[PDB]
């Protein structure tokens with residue numbers, strides 16, 4: 001997250017870190033056994049880390065649970081990043097409490113202008129490279145589909161939306177991928193892609209979660 005703020009320990013209780021020997025992506029806990037992330041985050045040997053603030057220090061609220069299975073969206077295209085969504089099942093159910101909690105799925109899509117909270121342990125610099133140890137947060141509005149398409153000609157599908165600031169300086173970044181965009185307590189987006197980070201006229205692009213609620217529910221119901 002570039003241009004954001006320190007969230008505060010366990011203030012984003014649905015935020016997960018995906019770990020394969022090191023943090024490599026975010027995710028969102030959607031019930032005691034399932035995490036939503038980006039398909040582009042797919043790899044084998046994932047350990048889901050819940051209750052994290054400092055990802056380099058054991059602070060007392062962590063739950064580390066190995067993934068038992070991953071399900072990339074049937075229509076994920078890695079070239080265009082269309083349908084950039086994946087489900088991860090935990091080997092055991094997470095113990096839910098105030099600091100480890102699921103986030104609600106939307107029942108309808110969010111509109112341009114809605115303020116959302118975007119979070120992660122990704123790069124904090126738009127030019128350089130600096131990775132934070134503690135969870136970073138950004139409040140950002142959803143942008144109109146027209147401005148999103150104007151920013152990224154030929155690249156925005158109906159499964160994507162833009163959020164952030166066309167002026168630059170405030171954005172998600174490398175390492176935030178797969179993490180949440182939460183709007184009025186609903187998971188509306190997944191950190192998916194962008195051109196650089198926090199660049200002028202290049203806002204963040206997010207997977208449009210409301211399109212996938214049917215697929216998520218039915219997938220969970222049979223797995």
Ligand SMILES: N=C(N)c1cccc(C=O)c1
Nearest residue numbers: 172173193194196197204
């Ligand atoms: N600018 C962003 N919001 C973003 C998100 C995820 C990855 C990347 C970099 O390729 C950029």
Ligand SMILES: [Ca+2]
Nearest residue numbers: 054057058059
């Ligand atoms: Ca920790």
